[PDB]
Amino acid sequence: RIPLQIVRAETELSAEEKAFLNAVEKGDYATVKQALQEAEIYYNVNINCMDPLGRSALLIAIENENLEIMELLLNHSVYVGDALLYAIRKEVVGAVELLLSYQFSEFTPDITPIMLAAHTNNYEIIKLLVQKRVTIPRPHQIRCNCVECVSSSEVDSLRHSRSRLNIYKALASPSLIALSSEDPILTAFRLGWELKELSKVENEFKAEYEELSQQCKLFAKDLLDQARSSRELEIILNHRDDLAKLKVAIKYHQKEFVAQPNCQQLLATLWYDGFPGWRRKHWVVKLLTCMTIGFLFPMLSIAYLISPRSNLGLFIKKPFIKFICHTASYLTFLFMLLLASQDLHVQGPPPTVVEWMILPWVLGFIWGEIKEMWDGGFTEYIHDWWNLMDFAMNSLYLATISLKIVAYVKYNGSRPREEWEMWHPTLIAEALFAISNILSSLRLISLFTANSHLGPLQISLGRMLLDILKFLFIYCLVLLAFANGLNQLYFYYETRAIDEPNNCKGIRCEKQNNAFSTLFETLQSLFWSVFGLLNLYVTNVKARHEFTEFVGATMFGTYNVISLVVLLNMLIAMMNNSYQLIADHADIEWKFARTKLWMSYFDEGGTLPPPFNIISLIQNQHYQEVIRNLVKRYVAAMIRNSKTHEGLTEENFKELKQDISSFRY
Amino acid sequence: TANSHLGPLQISLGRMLLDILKFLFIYCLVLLAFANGLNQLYFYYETRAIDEPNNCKGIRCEKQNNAFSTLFETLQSLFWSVFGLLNLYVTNVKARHEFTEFVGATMFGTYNVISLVVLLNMLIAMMNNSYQLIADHADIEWKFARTKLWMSYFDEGGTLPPPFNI
Amino acid sequence: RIPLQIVRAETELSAEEKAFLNAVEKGDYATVKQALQEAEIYYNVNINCMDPLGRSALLIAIENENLEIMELLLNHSVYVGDALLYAIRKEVVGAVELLLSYQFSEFTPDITPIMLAAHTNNYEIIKLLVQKRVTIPRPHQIRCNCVECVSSSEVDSLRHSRSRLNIYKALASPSLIALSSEDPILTAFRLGWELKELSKVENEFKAEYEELSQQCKLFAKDLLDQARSSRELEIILNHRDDLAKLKVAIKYHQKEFVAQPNCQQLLATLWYDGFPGWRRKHWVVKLLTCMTIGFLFPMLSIAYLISPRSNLGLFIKKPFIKFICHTASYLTFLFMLLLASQDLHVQGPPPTVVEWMILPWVLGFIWGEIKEMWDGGFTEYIHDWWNLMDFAMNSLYLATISLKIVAYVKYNGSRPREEWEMWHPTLIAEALFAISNILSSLRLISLFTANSHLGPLQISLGRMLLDILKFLFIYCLVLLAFANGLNQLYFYYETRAIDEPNNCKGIRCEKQNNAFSTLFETLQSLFWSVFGLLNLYVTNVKARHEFTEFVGATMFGTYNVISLVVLLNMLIAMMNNSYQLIADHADIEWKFARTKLWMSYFDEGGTLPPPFNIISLIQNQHYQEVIRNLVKRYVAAMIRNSKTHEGLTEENFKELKQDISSFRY
Amino acid sequence: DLAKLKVAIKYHQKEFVAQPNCQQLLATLWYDGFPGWRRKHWVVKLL
Ligand SMILES: CC(C)CCC[C@@H](C)[C@H]1CC[C@H]2[C@@H]3CC=C4C[C@@H](OC(=O)CCC(=O)O)CC[C@]4(C)[C@H]3CC[C@]12C
Ligand SMILES: CC(C)CCC[C@@H](C)[C@H]1CC[C@H]2[C@@H]3CC=C4C[C@@H](OC(=O)CCC(=O)O)CC[C@]4(C)[C@H]3CC[C@]12C
Ligand SMILES: CC(C)CCC[C@@H](C)[C@H]1CC[C@H]2[C@@H]3CC=C4C[C@@H](OC(=O)CCC(=O)O)CC[C@]4(C)[C@H]3CC[C@]12C
Ligand SMILES: [Ca+2]
Ligand SMILES: [Ca+2]
Ligand SMILES: [Zn+2]
Numbered sequence A, C: 001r002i003p004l005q006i007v008r009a010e011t012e013l014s015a016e017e018k019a020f021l022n023a024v025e026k027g028d029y030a031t032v033k034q035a036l037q038e039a040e041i042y043y044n045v046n047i048n049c050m051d052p053l054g055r056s057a058l059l060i061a062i063e064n065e066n067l068e069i070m071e072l073l074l075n076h077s078v079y080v081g082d083a084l085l086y087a088i089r090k091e092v093v094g095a096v097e098l099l100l101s102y103q104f105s106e107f108t109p110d111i112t113p114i115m116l117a118a119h120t121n122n123y124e125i126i127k128l129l130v131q132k133r134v135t136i137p138r139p140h141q142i143r144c145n146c147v148e149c150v151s152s153s154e155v156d157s158l159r160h161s162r163s164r165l166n167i168y169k170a171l172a173s174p175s176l177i178a179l180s181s182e183d184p185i186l187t188a189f190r191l192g193w194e195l196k197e198l199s200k201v202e203n204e205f206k207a208e209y210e211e212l213s214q215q216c217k218l219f220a221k222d223l224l225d226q227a228r229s230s231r232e233l234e235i236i237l238n239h240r241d242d243l244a245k246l247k248v249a250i251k252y253h254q255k256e257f258v259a260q261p262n263c264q265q266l267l268a269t270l271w272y273d274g275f276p277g278w279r280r281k282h283w284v285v286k287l288l289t290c291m292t293i294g295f296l297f298p299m300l301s302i303a304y305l306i307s308p309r310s311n312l313g314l315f316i317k318k319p320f321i322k323f324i325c326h327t328a329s330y331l332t333f334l335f336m337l338l339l340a341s342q343d344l345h346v347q348g349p350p351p352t353v354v355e356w357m358i359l360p361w362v363l364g365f366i367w368g369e370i371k372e373m374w375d376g377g378f379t380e381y382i383h384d385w386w387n388l389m390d391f392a393m394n395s396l397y398l399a400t401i402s403l404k405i406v407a408y409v410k411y412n413g414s415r416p417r418e419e420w421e422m423w424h425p426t427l428i429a430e431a432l433f434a435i436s437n438i439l440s441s442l443r444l445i446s447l448f449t450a451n452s453h454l455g456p457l458q459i460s461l462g463r464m465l466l467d468i469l470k471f472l473f474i475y476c477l478v479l480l481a482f483a484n485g486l487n488q489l490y491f492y493y494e495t496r497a498i499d500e501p502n503n504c505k506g507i508r509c510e511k512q513n514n515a516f517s518t519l520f521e522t523l524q525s526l527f528w529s530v531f532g533l534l535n536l537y538v539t540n541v542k543a544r545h546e547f548t549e550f551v552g553a554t555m556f557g558t559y560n561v562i563s564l565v566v567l568l569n570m571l572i573a574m575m576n577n578s579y580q581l582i583a584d585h586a587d588i589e590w591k592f593a594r595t596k597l598w599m600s601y602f603d604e605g606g607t608l609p610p611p612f613n614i615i616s617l618i619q620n621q622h623y624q625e626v627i628r629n630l631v632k633r634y635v636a637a638m639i640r641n642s643k644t645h646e647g648l649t650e651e652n653f654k655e656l657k658q659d660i661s662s663f664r665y
Numbered sequence B: 001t002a003n004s005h006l007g008p009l010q011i012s013l014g015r016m017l018l019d020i021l022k023f024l025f026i027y028c029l030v031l032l033a034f035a036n037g038l039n040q041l042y043f044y045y046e047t048r049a050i051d052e053p054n055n056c057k058g059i060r061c062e063k064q065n066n067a068f069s070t071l072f073e074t075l076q077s078l079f080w081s082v083f084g085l086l087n088l089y090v091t092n093v094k095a096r097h098e099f100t101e102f103v104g105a106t107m108f109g110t111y112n113v114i115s116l117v118v119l120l121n122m123l124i125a126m127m128n129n130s131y132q133l134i135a136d137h138a139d140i141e142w143k144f145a146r147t148k149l150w151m152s153y154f155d156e157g158g159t160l161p162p163p164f165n166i
Numbered sequence D: 001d002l003a004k005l006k007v008a009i010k011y012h013q014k015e016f017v018a019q020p021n022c023q024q025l026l027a028t029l030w031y032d033g034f035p036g037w038r039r040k041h042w043v044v045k046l047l
């Protein structure tokens, strides 16, 4: 039999001090007033009593929303501590104003009235509080090591983290940004960037910072949405302190802001400068004009080089024409590379005509690469992740040219490749040239972002590469373990290449042998076993060691099972789970990428294609006026969205009943 | 588990091992049935290792022979048939028993279809369905595992590493 | 400029006839009464006027729910047509009773007040209407070809279908089953079965019938849920007109009813008859007792056969012991079959000891099969879909025995198999025996339903077999097309087996040749190409017909692409989509299957394992009382669930305000 | 120390264990020697 009792006992009640609490709970004004005045005359009661549910007279008045009992209690000199915070958090303007005009608490001691107003995001009460000179502390830099920060973290770290989070949550309020801010858009950009940076440093508190950054981005997008004229749109997008604001938004990774329909329409208008009917055109005529502009790229380049100011001179300044010319030049370079492969008995031959034509394009590519790193900088150069492939290709081409010139200078004989050594400079140069051709042909993937059908697909594939890289580590660990074991088992029976039928050793021969004799060959065999290109008799020895053969076969079968049946199927499940979430924002990611690609062609520098490449207060006032108009529209819209819900409004009957009762009285 | 990027993945792989173990039973039953049938059919034509071209008997030789002569060899051949490392002429006899050869080929094809087209695809669907639900609590499971691993080093005992421990 | 006007013009209004409509809309009793009496005295108004929104005075009174204006209008002799239906459909009891006591319509002409009450499913109004002698028409049998049905469908088919659907929807009401039904559970079973059958016949109207059947099943399950004693539960499950109701529910496919926790607990209690602490036992001791009971199956069978009434005689009557004994007998038979494979130079040898022991088990299996078809019937025998495999295995065994006896009678020599013919009875018998062994070993899958971990998996695999069968048709069509094409192309260059290096023709040789010479070989090669067991040089000819070789290679590559890259990946997507929906009801399906398997062992017949097999108004009154109690509980619970929502009830202020105003007056 | 945490780990209270405050305290105890490990570069951490 479980003796149910009270373990933590509170104080007793049911005196006159509880009588007048329950009178206040009833709320009848006359009875409350008479009981309170009688108790005050008697001078034997207090006002510190607490109900079992955790509410007092003032808290119950807060919950019931009765201004008459509110003013009566406040004029009766009841306790006032935290009552302003409770009223602000209850979100009633009349009692907030009344309390402003004049133990156990569910409020953190660091909470300020302005902080709570910012947390609750109420425009009216926020303005009412901010009309007085109220301020907010500064949280220190992200990696501050100053004595004040180290000391405060040492005495109490949980309170410090909570205070920082509360300060940032109050600062990231859309209303508190609408007021007391000269540039709300820039403020939102910087705040979102700072919160995104803070999320990584504060590992335990990540979701809160991420949601604050998302809220800032959404506020910026909603503020942009209210523009209702092309003049206002261009003023906003061109304000600086062209398209400086758009460049800043691209830098700060504001994909929702960038992918706005109005901004995209303006960008398309700027992009299709030469053609004004490109929107209303047939696919056949678009294709025909595409070839007819791409075919005359050398003529256009020569015309611009000769006469920069002419009818044909300025025809290449348009971004679309420049993009078409660059694409045609790259396609011509790739065609030359393909034609190159279509006497081989000389040692270090002079370059042929195809290589002579290929060299100016390669030199131009390198020149264009260095200028962009000099103009952009190291961080911008490495952020693209395509410049890595560009640098690798250019370095490989430079090494190929150097090796070819070295071979030409050194060797001058005529000997067969069957007698040439394995480390010949000519052979090294051909291998590097083949790798360079592979990389250059693979470089064409970056042009898929300009298309409507392939951009999101390419963006989705790029996102999944990360999961591929993550699984590669586990696969490599398993492969290393099994290769170590197999080599340790099989390294005893190594045989020389002379004893083999065709003087061939390894797995790249018809007589596959010595598959696990060395660690490198074991790694190669275990890699090739995934695709089923390794035979089954490689796990055999010339001697009759049936136990050893069976153990090796068991190891091989276990590795095959683990690699193919379990790990490969698990990768597939991860790809599906990742792509399900990836497919949601494909449009936004593709539009951001296409905007970056489009703006990459707006600059005046580098107009020519690679082969020929080698050879101020009025604006502030206008922006302020437009920002004021947008803020007013946004405030109205968000007030309405707050009014969209709770459609079953009340107290209209109470107000009318009070009025008619007074008239009857 | 000590890393932020690999912990949930390892935890997810560990959770799926159970479904792997559950499917292994059905696969083993099917394999045992088909191996019993194939051995019962083919055990009549066993040949000695002397008559073989290289004195090699079994499936681990270039001349793959006697694949279904014994139950153990039948099990090994049916296991290796999943990865396509078993040839097609193993279902042949020196005599001209075309009916027996056709029946053996039909059994082999039925086993291949059942094992590869139906059971392997069904495992994949189960892995997706399990991982969908698994991915929800990956953070909680990884944090619990990392907390256990961290608290495994708080005790005073065993401070020294293994070579100096003895 | 789009001239917006009225295309379909109604009648004019705004006379006194509209004045008194808007007076009724206002609802002030005194003004409405005085206006109506003045208009009646004037004798110049009507009551047929209609508002632009499609409502009249009575309809607006229905919507506003004002009993005083209701009785005033009804006593003023307004039009009454369809008003009862509008009130019943508005679901207000006071005005329904008032209207019962005394053009354009949104109601189908076939709608009856009782039909609408059944559609709306209101217990109170349904009872109020049914207290009078009201009835419902009969819809005819599913495939009725009678003149009345053919004539009514000929004059108007849409109206006929609508009338049938409305009649069935009214009949399938849970409240209309609670009233006016002696056996609500049996009525719900039959109604659900009939609606499920109707869904297939009425192809256009499927979702409605399916949802009606689901509603009937849910009502039956909810009615069963209210049982609150073991006595009531067993009375319900044993009522007949043992476990007759459970057998009927299993026959009618009531998986939700069967999988109830109370029914499952009772079934488990009946199943674990011998062991009362089986729930609280260790896995090790459960396993130990499982082997210790399965090992003594022949001793237990012999003891039961000798002394049916003894301590050991009745130990096999328990269902769990019987199941264990049968499983052990089948495992022993499979072990004997395995041992069988472990002189071969004789023609038609006599059977060996292993076959002599195997024959009694095979004869017992056949005897047990025929008895079950004789006892069950053709439909029950073919519904299991395991009896098909049982029949195939038994027929194969019979054919093997017949062929063996024929060979023994006919052939008596000693000739080598290398000289035996290809159609030898001995070889045919061995092939049939191998196929029988495969089938018998595959029969063990059906025992997975008794386990908690494998049942849902087996059930899920069984559900997906249907999608496998559906995809097989498309695959077969593609294979037939490509095989026809390849054979037509390649049949010109057929070569004889003598010219081949090893006198081997076909794809089952080392020298793979004549892969597409015949249609059968083309089919076999295209089948084996899926697993990559067909080489690439089979698409070659001895002559130098490079064009023909290239065309054949192109056909082969196209077939490979279509079969492997497109069709195989599409099957996977279908399996995932099907399994997502399949995984929801796995528990219910597994519990239904396990209940069927458990009840398969409750009968007295066939107690012995296969080798030894060859050698009445008080109950009605109690059921009626229990059904009445369950109906009362269900009605209370569903009334409360109707009261669970709309928690913001009203008209309490209106009633109190009316009362205090009358007291003040 | 951390007897209640040990009991919670024994009783498989993963939600209780994965609380942000408990994780912060555990990280503080784990990174005893280095107090600026949170604010450090990947290169210097690796070094
Ligand atoms: C995977 C292939 C390339 C074989 C490599 C074998 C070893 C060199 C690897 C395998 C697993 C690795 C470990 C995996 C994870 C960790 C935890 C990691 O912990 C942290 O990073 C703690 C700091 C933090 O992330 O907050 C420190 C390195 C270490 C021990 C790694 C050290 C290097 C190991 C032993
Ligand atoms: C799968 C491979 C390794 C071949 C093994 C063949 C047989 C030895 C297996 C195949 C299916 C097995 C059966 C699958 C499921 C069950 C139900 C199982 O029932 C229970 O556990 C009841 C108690 C409970 O779980 O509440 C008893 C064992 C049995 C008959 C198993 C006995 C052993 C069987 C016949
Ligand atoms: C798929 C493999 C086995 C090759 C078989 C080739 C033909 C014999 C098949 C391929 C497509 C079949 C057709 C697919 C679908 C239909 C529609 C089908 O229409 C109905 O069933 C109408 C009645 C109804 O379902 O309400 C009549 C048979 C027909 C023409 C089939 C006739 C037989 C066809 C031509
Ligand atoms: Ca670049
Ligand atoms: Ca049966
Ligand atoms: Zn500081």
Ligand SMILES: [Zn+2]
Binding pocket: C140, C141, C144, C145, C146, C147, C148, C149
């Ligand atoms: Zn009829």
